[PDB]
């Protein structure tokens, strides 16, 4: 996200988002500083394991699918998906990885569909009882559990490069007052005077 005008206080006052909590910096004291680039990712996991999307923690999705760097000052936003994602008959388009070679690095995307070796034998295409397909689907049913109910989780991150800033608050303004001695403020000037 670049050259944008973004509002952040409407998310706290939306009154429909279950997890309005993250680390780094509060969104109330966030709009007073200017930022140059906004990142956004979208993924779907089930209910009760939404806690381990944070650096320095273990898990299955955290260690093998998606993780965060140690100096992560961004925010995480999640909400329920009872209507759109969950239906009758199941949805086999939502899958999560199981197998990879080593510990994950932050911020990379893997579409490696090649089956992961476990023993010393070669895999060679067809499943050789150890070289497994690392993707497993989800069984979506409207009478699932609380921890098995799918959630729509969106993470965001902020940075500060040498590029010029894009979004500051945009911090709004006040009304216009004329013919009175006021402290006028503008885009790049401050001073005291009367406006006519």
């Amino acid at each position, epitope marked *: 996200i670049s050259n944008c005008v973004a509002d952040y206080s409407v998310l706290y006052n939306s009154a429909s988002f279950s997890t309005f909590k993250c680390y780094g910096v509060s969104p109330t004291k966030l709009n007073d500083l200017c930022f140059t680039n906004v990142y956004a990712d979208s993924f779907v996991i089930r209910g009760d394991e939404v806690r381990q999307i944070a650096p320095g923690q*273990t898990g299955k999705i955290a260690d093998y699918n998606y993780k965060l760097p140690d100096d992560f000052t961004g925010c995480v936003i999640a909400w329920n998906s009872n209507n759109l994602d969950s239906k009758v008959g199941g949805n086999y388009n939502y899958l999560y990885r*199981l197998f990879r070679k080593s510990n994950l690095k932050p911020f990379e995307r893997d579409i490696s569909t090649e089956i992961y070796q*476990a*023993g010393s034998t070669p895999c060679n295409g067809v*499943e*050789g*009882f*150890n070289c*497994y397909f690392p993707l497993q689907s989800y069984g979506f049913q409207p009478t699932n559990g609380v921890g098995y109910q799918p959630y729509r989780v969106v993470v965001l991150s902020f940075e500060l490069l040498h590029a010029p800033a894009t979004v500051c608050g945009p911090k709004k303004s006040t009304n216009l007052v004329k013919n009175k001695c006021v402290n006028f403020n503008f885009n790049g000037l401050t001073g005291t005077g009367v406006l006519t």
Partner: antibody
Amino acid sequence: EVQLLESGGGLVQPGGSLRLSCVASGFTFSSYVMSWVRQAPGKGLEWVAAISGSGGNTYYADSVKGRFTISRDNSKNTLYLQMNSLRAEDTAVYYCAKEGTYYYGSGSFWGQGTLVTVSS
Amino acid sequence: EIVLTQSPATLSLSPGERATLSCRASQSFHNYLAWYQQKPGRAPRLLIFDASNRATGIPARFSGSGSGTDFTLTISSLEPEDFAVYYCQQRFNWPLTFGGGTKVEIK
């Protein structure tokens, strides 16, 4: 399946062979891949054999270089047992069991099994 | 190939103070472990179905903990079924050597 047919035992002298079976009926062989383990009175447990649920690859154990012969058929979904040159190591209990519907382990419920006794 | 070490055999003590199991295996794992309960004269059955999670038919008296190289439990309540033998089992590494368990000496 919630139940399993109870197998039998044998009192074969050393140097002979054993032929028993533990076969259920009306059960899908593709799911709940079979596994055989020895309940040793002593050292512990070790897996024996595991064949593909649709008929295919099977694996020999580390201590079994083809000594415990695995000749199983998928048309009748045969669950059997055959070996040669019987030894004093076979003084244990044979268990017929199966793990979850996936190939990797996800929970295995076991049977009562029958003990086999070696005496020369 | 894969070594399962099952305790230094010094935990055979009184069943008080909620003694745990020190099954150690310092090698590569995918946190896919299952545990078994055996009484003499009785065929063993499963305890957990994926990892640290009770299956159907057992209450929350057993709750696993640990990943990667170490795994343990916290027992909740004393019971006549606590005077029995626990087993440690792993699911990968298809040669599939298993644990040995340990004894409990009541004091």
